[PDB]
Amino acid sequence: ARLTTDYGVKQTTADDWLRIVSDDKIGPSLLEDPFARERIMRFDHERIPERVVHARGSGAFGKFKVYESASDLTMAPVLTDTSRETPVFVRFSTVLGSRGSADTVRDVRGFAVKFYTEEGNWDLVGNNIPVFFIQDAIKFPDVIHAGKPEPHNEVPQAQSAHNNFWDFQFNHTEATHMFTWAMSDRAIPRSLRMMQGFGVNTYTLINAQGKRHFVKFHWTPELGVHSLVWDEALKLAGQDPDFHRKDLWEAIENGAYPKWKFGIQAIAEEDEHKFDFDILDATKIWPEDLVPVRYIGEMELNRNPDEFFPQTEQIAFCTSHVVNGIGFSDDPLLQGRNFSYFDTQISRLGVNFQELPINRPVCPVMNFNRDGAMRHTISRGTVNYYPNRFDACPPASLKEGGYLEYAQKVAGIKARARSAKFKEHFSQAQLFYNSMSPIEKQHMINAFGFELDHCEDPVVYGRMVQRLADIDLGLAQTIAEMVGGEAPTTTNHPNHGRKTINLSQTEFPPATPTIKSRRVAIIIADGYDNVAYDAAYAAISANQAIPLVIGPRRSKVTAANGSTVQPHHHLEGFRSTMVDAIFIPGGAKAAETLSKNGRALHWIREAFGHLKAIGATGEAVDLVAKAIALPQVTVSSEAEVHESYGVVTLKKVKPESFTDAVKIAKGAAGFLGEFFYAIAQHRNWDRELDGLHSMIAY
Amino acid sequence: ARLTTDYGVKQTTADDWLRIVSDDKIGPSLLEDPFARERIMRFDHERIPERVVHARGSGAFGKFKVYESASDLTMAPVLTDTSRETPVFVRFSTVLGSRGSADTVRDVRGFAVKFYTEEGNWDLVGNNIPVFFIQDAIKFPDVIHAGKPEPHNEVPQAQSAHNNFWDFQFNHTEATHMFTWAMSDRAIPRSLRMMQGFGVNTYTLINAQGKRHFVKFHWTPELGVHSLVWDEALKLAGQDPDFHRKDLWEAIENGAYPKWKFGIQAIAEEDEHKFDFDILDATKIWPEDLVPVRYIGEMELNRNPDEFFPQTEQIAFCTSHVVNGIGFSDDPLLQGRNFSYFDTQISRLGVNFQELPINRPVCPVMNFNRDGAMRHTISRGTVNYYPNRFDACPPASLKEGGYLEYAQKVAGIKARARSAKFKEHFSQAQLFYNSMSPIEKQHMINAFGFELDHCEDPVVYGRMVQRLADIDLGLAQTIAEMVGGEAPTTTNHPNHGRKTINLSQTEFPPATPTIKSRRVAIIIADGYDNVAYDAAYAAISANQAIPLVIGPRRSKVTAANGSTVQPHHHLEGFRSTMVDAIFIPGGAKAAETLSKNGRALHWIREAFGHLKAIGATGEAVDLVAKAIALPQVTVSSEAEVHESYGVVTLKKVKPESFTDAVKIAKGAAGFLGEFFYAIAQHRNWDRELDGLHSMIAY
Amino acid sequence: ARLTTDYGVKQTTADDWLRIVSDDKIGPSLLEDPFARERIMRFDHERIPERVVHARGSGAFGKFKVYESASDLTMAPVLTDTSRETPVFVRFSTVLGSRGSADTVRDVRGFAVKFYTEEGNWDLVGNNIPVFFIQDAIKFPDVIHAGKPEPHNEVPQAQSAHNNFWDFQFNHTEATHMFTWAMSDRAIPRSLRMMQGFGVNTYTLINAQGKRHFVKFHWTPELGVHSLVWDEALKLAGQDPDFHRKDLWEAIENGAYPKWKFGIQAIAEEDEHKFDFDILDATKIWPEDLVPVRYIGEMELNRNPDEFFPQTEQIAFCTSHVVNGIGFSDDPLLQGRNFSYFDTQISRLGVNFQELPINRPVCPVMNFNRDGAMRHTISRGTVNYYPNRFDACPPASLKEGGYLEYAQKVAGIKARARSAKFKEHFSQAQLFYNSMSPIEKQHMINAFGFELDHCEDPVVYGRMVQRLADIDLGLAQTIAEMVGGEAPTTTNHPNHGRKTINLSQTEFPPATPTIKSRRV
Ligand code: HDD
């Protein structure tokens, strides 16, 4: 392999333009040089427009397969064939930010899946939140413009924390349910692999008998639903803007393929109008206590892209992409969406976007669509229209797999309006808030407090405080004292206190106790205990977790016994925000050095403040106890394992200390068991519920 | 094969949009319909920008091979390997007209060849005229804008016959030589298969020893150089705007692959400054009496495109495309061209145009050029720059085929100017006019007369008449009496009368006497002589010519003997302008009917006026004689074959009449032989030289 | 004012698509609706390609004026007229990051100024660092690709802290001087209003007598040169990615218009070859102890944009934009740059980009350039070429202000190579490091330590440790103990210890003691 021009001509150098030159005097560059001009021209035109929304995203290839046929609901083979595996590509994303914005901002997350079925491409373009801000697609530009950077100065980037966003939220009551979800932990996921996915809009399924069902699609992570805490999310946005992109890529590269269970909620054609809300209203969820989610399949991502730009950046999804057996409903949000995903590709990619490798279906494509810019397809023949004398490219009958258009009855008048049930805008917002656990309510309170603090206009946060009273009077009062304004004492939308299942993240734990893919920092310094170090390192690895050694330097650290190791990073190059938990082995010399290292003390205080599991043995126990300096947090004093607020310690290490079985469960006996259990729980919420984090500086 | 969307979903119909409908009442179309929107969207975006120049063109695939190695001049394998065949695609075109303009207008013709060599793509982007209007590329917009439709009203289409064109010709004397060629028969070729091709600019060749030669490339048709006459060219422009496109496609489909000999003119590096003119001046030819053309190869076109748009419309050529062993010179016209063919593709096709099938090289392409709109190429790897730690994609040394940049010495100052010899602008214009045969001079005179007649501004044609005196005083006078103005009696640029070889088309006859691919109309009517008909039809076919039967109707025509035939076209659907010659068999009843048919009489008079061969036997002889009504044109009276001005007749057909050998040569004995000889001569110029065409109304 | 379509038809609502509907049942949306389709279509096509480099940036309007005529160096009125004020628009930016990336990352900062002079638009497209990574423009794609997110996974965003960047730095020694500047505090400015600006390449000035001078342009902040500290810069990148954009907008809105002094370094045509380095080598600075900076003007930014997208996002600069009296040199980096700023606009904006309000000159434009996509200009007349019979749009003579092309002598051969003096790649890197104050050296050490820590390939940081020995042996040892690798004990490029003036930020304090614009 040797350097060539794009037209195949080999070149002798990639370092000099053709110019006039002499040993002692340089001259002008020549216009004639085709190699140089081509290099610069290709470079000059590398960029294409970013997606108008969901510009920041990461994707991977995978496979989908149903383990239970849904033939009773649909005749689409992708959902009925339990023997075939369907290839997919999934792109996750944020919504408001442009291409270089951070992964860990507070925002809705896109969850788009392209199913390359034998019957054509089916795209399920969803989000990690089940509802949306608006009921009619016509207002998408309004809500997006309001959330995006303000027009005069293009501030702020990838943030809803500003005047215009909250101005729209207050003035468009349809969005009430949505901004409640937006302030919940759902909007700051720990990993794209640890969040749900939803079709959001109401679609339809048609079976072999022609019977139709209205449906909602669900994706549920087998690792469970987990989130970051705000201070941590903001730090990561700067310290590692690629946190989620790297998290996904790393897991797949390590063989920890993320999986999701695929479920369907179905309502028979005949029961369309049997609910208090309109089942086609995208600002409404279908309470699972009324319509259960039926899980029938599983999807896993098992292969990273070969090259990001031609694949992840150029992939195009659209709600318009449906295969036989799957259809649309009169959902007024979905209806306008179909128009958009085709239209936008014209300028973002080009009219022939379906020819791009990543977008092409895996089955035969036959039609008379022709030409267009950058056309690669060459079609032989003298005819390009139907009907024609050769009966070339005839339509497919229904029996041959032709798309079945449900003959839905339609009656009414042409008008710019929605039906009666769409007028209800507060009930589910209250239901959602009511269903949140205490810690989740606290996080939402902190979110409103931060967001409205960043609204400079007293009219904006003042009005929002009034609106919050329509969700919960107590909530309004708390926010009012935090950001200003006056919380009303009454409301025309009383909160009756009902709650529902499967809304709180507490109802989505991992399929089984695990710490798979979690990152655990092992903090050391010269003189560390090689014994505790070796035990933890092996146990972390053997439990599919990632051990990351952090030391004062990234060259060499010497253990108390003389053995050495090269840490992965030094204390200044990384931060606790980047890991799931920290472990510090003993060694008097090491503990003393770390106790005088401000950066190290911060690692401990921050990990504590961010509610992460902390484990320490030997002399490191006193290090942690003194770093935290909280009487509420007790530690081991002898050879007994001790746990307090997710802080696991063992001061006196004995021969049996690391011989106990490693059981990831409540009330484990050994040190590693209890430590891993704290990690498996993701975060220690009691630490925050008891206000301990508020006492620490991090 | 069944109808599907571009994303692979089978459809049941291509005739109805999804709408609200009932048996007796139709309703509105639905926005949700993805199949219909995709159909219309693809259609809405089918067009791409036409080429800014040479927009109207036709192309085909073929092969090239040298039969004599030019290793003494270059080490480029494409010009030294006599055992390999190099695939090529050639696109011919006009210059000024937009996409739907006519093939047979008066204009320079493009002759672009893309050589898909094993060492990369080499493009020889030439024209059918050896020189150009300007010396510096910076003025291309000026000459093109002047010739193109005038800006205020966009008139006229594909014509140099208007004020602005001739305004520029007069004011920019560098163009004198060129407009002389433009008014010659070279600008109205009979077929793209019957014209020469030239690189025009001076290129360079470098051999294995590193020695360089300045060169000119030539393409010479084996069918010879032939042209149409003006009245005919204009009629065809309307009657069949695709005349040349069809001519090329038909010949190839019929197995008559057009061929050209490839030749090179070479001047040693050391003799660069040994001529009166600058050898890098594109407004100058290298007189073949001074520098002979060395023919070393042959190219043939043998395959029509599979689909016009993705291939012929999207192919991109550029002077920048050169392979090792071939280089550029300081030709100030060529220098700027190199910049243009890359630049223009950005908007016409797209930055990734080299990825299109038709443009891709046939050898490996390896470099770090990346991304860009509509990117199909996927490159695995973590590096995309040089130098890199994996030494990925290193440059090729000269021994490995790396492009050799000649270390040409350069000395002077930075300035917007040309050197001394470039200042000569009239000598070769005179040489060209002097070298033209009498008939060619007459055709040029008629051209200037027609072109200037179409110039509304007295200042424009008035000045041009003055300029013509700088070419030939007699020419100026003749044009002045034809279009107005006052021809000067003197000139500061005397024409010394010298002539040179290989300029007149008379010096480019076919490789051997032939009528291959020529079209011959056989005009009949009920009662025609089946004998003469059968004889001519078989002889035409057996000599690789195309017999086209033309009758009063296109259903059935009955011969005098009762046999029948269905003509290819009726008299009103075709015209003599579309064929090379006409033949009319006998049959008293047929001749009588045709003698009273105005359209038929016109076929004869027009064929005569356009100088085409006319053959007739039996009763058709009197038909032709009376249709032409010229004493100067004599015809057979007995059983003897008679020829007069390309009109071949035989009044009394005998058993031996069609048993003579068919010899295409001067003074043949048989009727078919003499008739075919007249056809092989292309046109009868004596007919025009003696003013016989002027006596006929057609 | 009432809601209308783009074609002027008033609408009754912006909340509902036209559909089939009844009091109790909603129906499908109608295809016929032009108002709704137009709303969504305009929205669907709002975005245009971001700049291939310097995608993240912020700008403002201002004015420039020379207080001392430089007529001895040039006859360009913008630099000789002390009575006129020249309007300008300035866009500041980072280099590697895409549009939504953070303001406070470690990176070179772009400092582009468009001068709307009466004699045409003059753009001075500079950076906040005086030198560059490469000597020949042909390698721009290499250094940019190396620094940008790696191709397979598009990681990391707006950071030089990764394998490929440091792989290129080590392997292309021309970049040694540059990466030293990149690790200094210059790459993490506290404010765009507190950093210098440099033309970087060597330009030329021609006076009324036709005499030429080779020059370097300088912008020096009156508030002084100040920087953030790393931990702070990283936190801000997440806590307020618009920190610099807001800093600039706020200051201007509050009436604290940022100012810069404009200076010129000039070398007479005759002394072109009198230095150890080639004066046209962009990897070299002209030591101010050898060639002093002559300050002659001042520029201030005093007005924020009316709308970011049509102005700040769409503005196009190019080194090709020079007015009479200002020209180019054979600087092999500048030479290729001229080609690029015109070419890239074709896909980023469109061929008629010069018609956009923000790009249009303030003086008459007359030529025969025509058509092109989205053409707004309408030209009356039947002629569009030169020469023509009406002598329409004739050229301007030199006395009439026509651009003066210096008749520079040129002699040599056509070849892909640079001259002798370009071969020196380490001297100034050492000079720069030597000139840094103790605190600045410490910050650079911390930078190398952080950057190389983020290089996963032992070969990458291992080689860089070896390269650092060519700058300073002590530096290499310190970095080696911080990130790994083995610091060599010797070097073929000894550091002689010489220092020079005006490199350390300590030599650029505010014009006068102040806390103006500071937040407390
Ligand atoms: C009619 C306009 C409209 C409406 C009402 C919505 N969107 Fe949308 N969306 C677009 C118009 C759009 C778009 C402008 O057409 C985008 C960006 C560019 C593109 O390719 O598609 C897009 C992309 C886009 C993506 C990114 C696909 C990718 O990764 O490329 C996701 C995940 C969603 N949308 C999700 C949703 C959800 C869950 C919605 C609420 C039910 C929603 N969108 C309503």
Ligand code: HDD
């Ligand atoms: C610098 C500008 C310039 C100059 C001085 C010329 N041309 Fe050119 N030509 C172009 C700029 C151009 C172009 C604008 O770049 C075109 C049209 C679009 C395209 O692809 O290439 C083109 C196309 C084009 C084609 C058509 C290739 C095809 O079939 O696509 C031919 C045959 C020529 N040119 C021939 C010539 C000859 C024989 C010239 C005189 C020696 C000449 N051109 C001078």
Ligand code: HDD
């Ligand atoms: C030949 C390629 C090339 C080279 C060698 C450089 N650049 Fe460049 N630069 C471009 C090719 C480019 C570009 C690709 O054409 C850009 C981005 C898109 C655009 O409009 O211009 C650009 C933009 C760009 C901008 C942003 C203008 C804005 O705000 O829009 C600045 C400040 C610079 N460059 C500064 C420099 C400096 C100080 C350089 C070293 C002396 C340099 N560039 C070398």
